[model samples]
Target: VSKIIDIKTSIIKIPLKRTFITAVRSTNHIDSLAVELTLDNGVKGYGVAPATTAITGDTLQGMQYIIREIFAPVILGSDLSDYKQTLELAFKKVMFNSAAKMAIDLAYHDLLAKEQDISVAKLLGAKANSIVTDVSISCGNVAETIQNIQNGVEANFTAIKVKTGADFNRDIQLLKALDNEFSKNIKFRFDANQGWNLAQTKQFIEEINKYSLNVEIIEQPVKYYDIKAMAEITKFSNIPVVADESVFDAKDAERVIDEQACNMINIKLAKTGGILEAQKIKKLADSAGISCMVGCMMESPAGILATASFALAEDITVADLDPLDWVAKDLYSDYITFNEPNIILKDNLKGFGFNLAENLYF
Candidate 1:
């Protein structure tokens, strides 16, 4: 007699120290939708569906309404164990939105793990207890970007991602500054976030060729829709080009690979709907011999933990968890302890294995 009993939603705002901008997305606060669920069996589960209009076209009110009017009714009497059917009903019968669907999906997965008394990472087959995360040095001036990079290094994050694509001179200046500071000891990558033109990209590659900075990869330097141009740019660049906005799901991954558009792909569960479908995109990327990384939107602990578990199960070596989560102190409950940059997962923690701060409502 497992039935959906209650559904509540709220807004959580986490402020970024500075404005975060790229080609498509710009934000000052981490706006997210928090979903709390009470099952008929007296099990309580919490999940999150962050609103990123640029990524998933999900707004806060849109997520709330979908959960209330469209999704709440159809899931009222169904068996909670059948997550596959749950999702099918979500996609088929409900209004079919990622923000609404993932919140419930994550809650169900969390409840299942709670019932089994297992960590979500273990449920997903994670061999690594702790995963390394990248720190972002967003678009800014040379000195400011350098300061950001140093901050990341101080936080003990091993990998780094920098956002460029504003102006070639400014981007190159930042790269040179970082090279003069950290050098080959750290792994680094760049994300234009679809901020470059093909010609500008070629010129930037030429600049990089003049001096090797031990850079790992470059992501979405041009428009996401121009696959043929991306392939040409990839061929000419010394560093591998990664497809970020270029591909959305498995179909996009397949097309990118078949067309040889880029050398790597970065998958965000929010962008792809959820883990179930993301796994499919990962398989397609793996089969195509492309490197993949699991990335998350500016999510809270709930969505972050869920994505961390999902990333562990997939072929994701590099990750960028919410860096701002580390910056802001009072946003989430202190259920989980943070050691500067590392978010440690407990071995026996159940469900999505997220440790919430004592004061957290959901």
Candidate 2:
């Protein structure tokens, strides 16, 4: 009934080099789910979700099914501006495929932002357009990883997050090398991605502490489904355990907090389906006195920009938006304008802030 006329979708193949932790992600090629919602007024809003078949079991087929079957049926005719109500319905009705839902929800939000003629951040109540974001350097040979870290450092990124689930020995070695080289000025963090068990993480953190490594935090050292194990692991780790995979919705956040799963929560737009539910996750975590960090899957500029829009409105201590730096070029002929040191949402442009190039298949 509103201005929105219809919705469309497509699949894009994004390419990535084996920068770091290549063994973990399996394929350098990433499949993306792109969606566009057009309004009757000739304005269109674009959004996307990076569909990682290896990491999240999200195949291109499943992604298409979600947009065609589950999402289209629920909100095709709904008012585009009614983001809160429509977003809530999807979060409640759609139990899974959060990444897919995030695409649609964000597209609708983009439509609303365009209607209002403001940056999505201003619409979301964010006080600032740009916030401090940390860069992630996944596992690799010590020299290679350190080179990547230097790239991030040269870019003036506020912090660096390293991935540690692949090999323990190399992880320790990399930290030692970074310390010996980078000095103590950089805030160093690690994400094990459930690569280590409770005892393994404990031993590693205990050892890392001995050298005064200044490890800021560790995220998801154990499997996410094991809430009890996560809580037990968080209780004794030297560094604060930030729950990356453990939090999904408000109920999941409550369970993690009540059970003492971790000290912080990493909220990703795709994980919670969109900003509407992501907001709830943030509220639940903050009420429990846990800090929040906004992150993303290996999303492109469209999706990460959407995440940055929401980050502007939330009370987040950390930001992770590098998937675009790795996976954006192949997905879009026109890459995001990364003129700044890192991706900063300071333009305050309307909607997604990017025009659809003719090359975009969707």
Candidate 3:
């Protein structure tokens, strides 16, 4: 039997290829809480949370404090086989420091997988070795947005996530431009990220229907807490509406699934506390015939891959997991192959196959 010996955390900052801007926040780098774990069986694993205050409501310092004070005791001496229980106990001790919980839970699963000599994806019962992912086009100038779409189309990305913001007019123009150029071939995921109002959401959907744009999903058009309005939009909108921030855990999932809030749910490990909770939400949503999406928190390559692993599971209809591409001079570039939309993962590797790239070429 294996035992967890130590749990330590540090900070990781990786530069982005370009500045990622959304309606809530903007950043040129990924700042995360890196969880480092050493097991008594002489195996070590890592997990990182792309910590953000605006989105996940957890700062790096606070995450570190929570794990050290509240979570560590529950995990440190626990047998690896019962890690699921340990993390469940650890998570419940605290109220809402989910990002921190994600880091620990990811690292725990990683170490357990290593001990079992299997990939984390395999441990999670991956339905596929590879997953099709979408490149998210963040909020930028009209020219910048066009250029981003041009690159996505050129790269033959089947599904692309387009960010919509407060400026509804510019967004319409951008949509028109994207439709004018690449609408025939591309499937678009419009992520308003809770930036649009009910009126704007209705108008935007109407515009899409009017122009017959190839839109696949509409994400969180209204505010995060406005689930009723989102449900209203979902009932009328032609495209499947997705609930991102509206639903965090299984309880939240129940509320939406019961209320028929939206046709889809976006699961981010950062919000779900960990893979355990994320899977719970997915299973529940999938059972209800509601498709699911596995999205990232703009974490490091390791973190992005962890998020990507979830996408390989059944019924995860979409993956907004392009943060790996955002990493400047990414070390994992050599290990994983990206052929257009599908990201190839080494299914044979122990754990998630993530580590610090020694002397990675800058």
Candidate 4:
């Protein structure tokens, strides 16, 4: 029956290689939680979640409480084969704790895929093994930003994501230097993190056109609360607008779609509460002829791998799976390798294809 016998959680904390500066927050390290589930047959499953209070409003301790106390009673002893109902029982009862639910949700999917001896991507109906991603460069000064981009270029990234909105003139100055200094075929995506107003976004778009910067998409420039403003930007701006915080779940996606909020939606397992809901969001986004990007917060290898697997499973427009490396090089170097700009998936992964290092898990 592949009964889920036990479930456990652990915390992963690591210092960053450098401060990851976004307009909303600045941090020098990453703090996340990993969830592991063990089956009666001795099969195991794994998932990871980040403590991004600013975005998800979930703290590590809070997630731990939900996993160990709230979810455990309903999830333990459930059939992994009956995970859909089991997950609903464990998750629907809880209110708005997406990150916590995601950790357990991935763990269940991992076990199910392992039991069937198929990749998570294939299990999810995707004829895929790998995907490309973008190196999300955090907002910084001109030289610092340029250096990161150069490193990403050397690492063979053609599509790069740049954090923006710390300063207006500096954004223009940095773009001027970028356009002028090293002319390679680098397509840039700007993520404002709700750091700009309509006028600022307009000004930035004007500047991008002026510099002839190969802009791929601009992400969440204005606050997420105002879908009308988002629609305004979508209609008026020449470049595409991506709704990140605005489309956290299917209901949000519906609102965005009905309102014509933006050209794209960004999906994250944690954001949608799990891959199942992420698929829902992707379907909703796709039905409207809009594309999706699989994004991540700072995470351990397990978190990044699950994210990459989902990206591979779908026809994602762009994938921005950020660091285990942004926090430091190779938190699990042996297991993590490039799926191109995508996060690490050493060798072809069949299922959620990696193990948490002994040290990282309890």
Candidate 5:
């Protein structure tokens, strides 16, 4: 039987252009685990997962151990055609190592796509070849924040996502400054990163409404487990609330939709393990009349391409795949380009549509 013959695990450390500060944590660099799998036919595939305490809760040491000790045995000898069986075999024994699973699963998809001589999006039956992504601005001082927005607008970014959730007064002042400087035509999305409580979230929304700002959405204003409180905010606020940390899988999607907790969901490969599960969550959200935003954690080109493949495969209402822009240097070449807010894919490349840098590997 044709099967995967080899797999390689490597670690990469890349510096960020600036400190990316969120309510939960701040970092000046990213540590990611990159995986490469080779089929018996001599084709190779790649995947990547970033370690973050704020999100995946995985470390480089732990991710490598799981891939080498746990996933290697189950993945190496599995029939290449039996991809579903391979995915299940790799995951059934593990508990919550989603990052580990994501690395391997993405490699598997990549290998399969190469075998068919198609792009990953084509392999997944893509409806479009490009996606529009919203660029993010970390929480900072008023001057820094305004400058970031101005830079985004000058660069022709259509939508900007701003990080908030520190001091309420400072946040209000920042918003007011933005309002004074920009037009209502600019669409803004805010992420509180679970930094605010019910009252603070309501007050912030009230102020934005009172100012008549053009905020597109608010994401994860409260903690992940506080679904009831999130539902309360959705009812009180005029703007749509989207959940990021709150839902990781299909079951989480069900609970949030059933309770009417938020208007939408942000699906990250790091959150769903890989594309298959991410698709399942999307279908569930779609059936429930909820839109989706395909997001990312600080990821490499491999991981960003993996996410972009899925985002292009279907209709996601929103996208946040611009984390790689914060990189001080890029280690790989990708088909995706930012035309302001739109992510344009060349549409002709196959597999993950990128070549990894030989020197960037560990």
Candidate 6:
């Protein structure tokens, strides 16, 4: 058994290559906490977590303090081999600091997998080594939106996820314009980001049916609290609906499923706390015959690598880890590569698949 030796934490800010806008908020930079855990065996593990105020209610300073002050003491000097027990003990000290917990969780798993000389995917019993992702086009002006979709399609993205929820009439116009400009060979998914009310949602669906638009899925058309409304839309809408903000953990997953709230769920590493908890959520969705998409917050390569490995290891059907593609710079060398739309893990990589120690900086 290897003894946990030390825990180090720092913050890194990376600017976005372009202004990222969604229905909720817009940002020009992504700030994250980079965590490194070293074992007595000279093996180290790396994890990164973003403080997403819009979604997780976490800030960069808050995540740093929680990791450095709260979790470090509990995890230090514990036996790394008994990670399950150690994690249970450490997490018992607090509640709702998921971004803090996520960093430590990824690092611990990374350490263990390295010690066993196995990839994190194999350690997690993953059946696949890669996944295909749909590139996202956030809401914009008609010309700008159309141009972005054209670029994405030319880049070899087979499926497109459009961000809507600003205006019903404008959204309908955007879809129709997209259909005319782009090929029918491309599939479409829409994320309303809780922008539509029941009436608006129904209206959009009616228009979609009238025009026979190639819409495959619509995500979280109403506020997350209104499970009844979500279920109502899910029940009546011709297109399948996916729940994003509505469910944050496995317990939320249970609630949504029991109520039949939506057709599917979006699981982000940041949203579920980390890979361990996300695995539980995926299982719950699978048992109920509900599918899941592996998603991400705006993160650097370190965080993306970890999330990509987790997605490959699990039963995730859809992917939305395209945030890194918008970043101007990253610390680590490439661990995740995109083959057009598919996210492929580099071959013969181990322990989160990067030289984490070399690229990290405070």
Error of 5 at 22 (Å): 3.7
Q: How many clashes in each candidate?
A: 4, 1, 0, 5, 0, 0
- Model 5: residues with Cα > 4 Å off, grouped in runs: 24-26, 328-334, 356-362
Candidate 5 lDDT (Cα, whole model)?
0.83
lDDT of 6 at 156: 88
Which has the higher lDDT value, candidate number 3 or candidate number 4?
A: 3
CA error at residue 40 for candidate 3, angstroms? 1.7
Q: Write the per-residue lDDT of candidate 1 for residues 18-89, one digit (tens) a residue.
A: 777755677777777777677787876667778887767888888888887777776667777776787677
Error of 3 at 319 (Å): 0.9
List candidate 6 segments past 4 Å from native: 23-26, 328-333, 358-362
1 or 2, which is superior by lDDT?
A: 2
| Residue range 1-362, candidate 3, lDDT tens digits | 88888877787777887877765677888888878778887898888887878888899999999988888898898898898788878888888878998899889888878888988988888857777888888787778888988898787787889888667898888867776777466888989888888988999998887775788899999988888898899999879999998988899999999988899999989999888898889889878988888887778777767887777755465788887677753566644666768778864788988764342212
**lDDT value, residue 266 of candidate 4:** 82
**Candidate 4 local accuracy as lDDT?**
0.81
> How close is every model to the real structure, measured as TM-score?
0.89, 0.89, 0.94, 0.92, 0.94, 0.94
Per-residue alpha-carbon lDDT of model 2 for 243-313, expressed as tens digits? 98888677788889889999999888877777788888888877888988888876667777778778778
**Span of 10 residues, lowest total lDDT, candidate 1:** 353-362
> Which candidate should be chosen as best, given lDDT against the real structure?
5
CA lDDT, every model vs. true structure: 0.74, 0.74, 0.82, 0.81, 0.83, 0.81
Candidate 2, residue 68: the lDDT equals 78
Off by over 4 Å in 2: 1-3, 17-24, 88-93, 327-341, 346-348, 359-362
